[PDB]
Amino acid sequence: QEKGITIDISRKYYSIKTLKAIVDEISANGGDYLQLHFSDNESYAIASEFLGQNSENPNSAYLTKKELLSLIAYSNDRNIMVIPDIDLPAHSKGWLNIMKEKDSGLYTDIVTDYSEDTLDYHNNAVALYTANQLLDEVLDLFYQPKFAGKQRIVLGGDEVPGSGAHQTDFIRFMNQIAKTAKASNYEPQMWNDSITPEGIQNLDRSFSILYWKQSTLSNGAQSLDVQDFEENGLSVYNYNAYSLYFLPSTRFTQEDITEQIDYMKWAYAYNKFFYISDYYKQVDTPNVKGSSLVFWGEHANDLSQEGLLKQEKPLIQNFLGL
C-alpha cells in the first residue's frame, strides 16, 4: 500500500525551499511519492521550452528547470518518487492560453469549440500532436533512473466536458497519450470521474486510476465504482475528495487544522472511497494500491510560505501515520 502527497502548484506558487521542506516531512514519515500537479486552468507552473517558459531565474510564475531537477534529486535521495501530473484534455487553460499567444493559428486548430479550457480530444490530429510535444518534454524532465520501470505519470482525465456524450473520442484520446507515456516506460494514470460504463471496456489496461469521487451519469444513474475497475483489471488509488482533499487558506487557525486532523483520523482509511451512497465506503478488492492526501491551491492566494507549511506539515505527518 503506497502513500503519496499531492501538491497543486498550478493554483499556488510554492518556493523550492517550501517544497523541499514538504519532502523532508514525507521522508521522515515513510511516504512513497510526491505527485506534482503543475498544469491546470490557472497556470503551467514549471519551466517549458515548448511553451516559452525558459527563465533560469526564480520567479513567482514557475519553478525553473534547475529548481525542479533539484527537487526531484532531493526526493530520490530520500527514496521518494516524483510523479508529474499534467492534466489533459481539460484543466488545460493555462497552457492553452500560452498557445493562444504563441501561435494563434495552431490554437484555433487544437482548442474545443466551446471550452477555452479543453483541448480538442475529438479525434483531432494536430491537437494530439501538440499535446504529445508537451508530454515528451515532461517525461524527459521527470526521468528518474533510481525508479526505472516504476515511473508513473498522471495524465488528467478529470471533469472533461462532453465526455459522457463523446466517450469513444475521450477514451481514444486517453489511450493515445497513454502510448506516449508507455513508450518512455512510464505507467499512465488518470482520474476516475469521466470514464463511463460505455468507455471502460476500451480503456488501455496499463492505466491506473486515481479514485476521488464516484460520478453520476448525465441520466441520473450511478457510474463506475472500484469493483468495476477491478473487473477491468485496473488498479486504483484512493484520493477520497472528503477525507483526503484539503485546501490551505489564511482563513484557518491552527485549531481549525487540528479539527481537520481529528476528522481525517476517523474518516480516512486507505480503502475507504467516496461513493454516492457512502462517503467512506470500505472496499476490499485486491486492485487497491494506495492513497494520497491532496493539497489544492484554490484558496491559498495570500498564504505565506510559512503558513503553507504550518497547515500542511501536520496533515502530512498525520496522514502518513494512519
Author numbering: 3 to 324
Question: What do the paper's sentences say?
Answer:
DispTs3, DispTs2 and DispLp all consist of a single domain with the expected (β/α)8 (TIM)-barrel fold for GH20 catalytic domains. The β-strands in the centre form a tunnel atop of which the active site is located in a groove, presumably to allow long chains of PNAG to bind. GH20 enzymes use a substrate-assisted catalytic mechanism, also referred to as neighbouring-group participation (NGP), in which the reaction proceeds via the formation and subsequent breakdown of a neutral oxazoline intermediate.
Since DispTs3 and DispTs2 have the highest sequence identity, as expected they have a small r.m.s.d. of 0.63 Å. On the opposite side of the protein to β3, β4 and β5 is an α-helix, α7 (Lys246–Met255), in DspB and DispLp; however, this region is present as two short β-strands in DispTs3 and DispTs2. Interestingly, in the structure of unliganded DispTs3 an acetic acid solute molecule was present in a similar position to the N-acetyl group of the GlcNAc. The acetic acid also formed hydrogen bonds to Asp160 and Tyr247 with distances of 2.55 and 2.75 Å, respectively. A second tryptophan, Trp193 in DispTs3 (Trp193 in DispTs2 and Trp188 in DispLp) is present at the base of the N-acetyl group. A third tryptophan, Trp214 in DispTs3 (Trp214 in DispTs2 and Trp209 in DispLp) forms the side hydrophobic pocket in which the N-acetyl group is situated; mutation of the corresponding DspB residue, W237A, completely abolished all detectable activity on pNP-GlcNAc, suggesting that the hydrophobic pocket is essential to capture the substrate. An intense monosaccharide peak (≥5%), perhaps inferring a preferentially exo-acting enzyme, is seen for DispTs3, DispTs, DispLp and DispSf.
